[PDB]
């Protein structure tokens, strides 16, 4: 359910979601175009650390201003 703007892509709401899981994770490389960091839509706050900056928030409007790219 629309937890932030959009997970991988643009079109719809994360098919898997509960908490606005602001996941700034790179795994090792970060192979997608150039993620705009944290969005979420997953479950719990099980780690939130290491090389994974996670701003897991269970608020209603976790998505402050509809800006994606910008200029």
């Amino acid at each position: 359910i629309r937890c932030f703007i959009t997970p991988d892509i643009t079109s719809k709401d994360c098919p898997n979601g509960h908490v606005c899981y602001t996941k700034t994770w790179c795994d090792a490389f970060c192979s997608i175009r150039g993620k705009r960091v944290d969005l979420g839509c997953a479950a719990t706050c099980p780690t939130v650390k290491t090389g994974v900056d996670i701003q897991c928030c269970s608020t209603d409007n976790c998505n402050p201003f509809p800006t994606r790219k910008r200029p």
């Binding site: 959009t6 991988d8 892509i9 643009t10 079109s11 997608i32 175009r33 994606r68 790219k69």
Partner: peptide, 18 residues
């Protein structure tokens, strides 16, 4: 020409799942 993109990701226009 033609080959536009299947590139957007982060919103602007349609999808990047193709």
């Amino acid at each position: 020409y033609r080959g536009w993109k299947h590139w957007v990701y982060y919103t602007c226009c349609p999808d990047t799942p193709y």
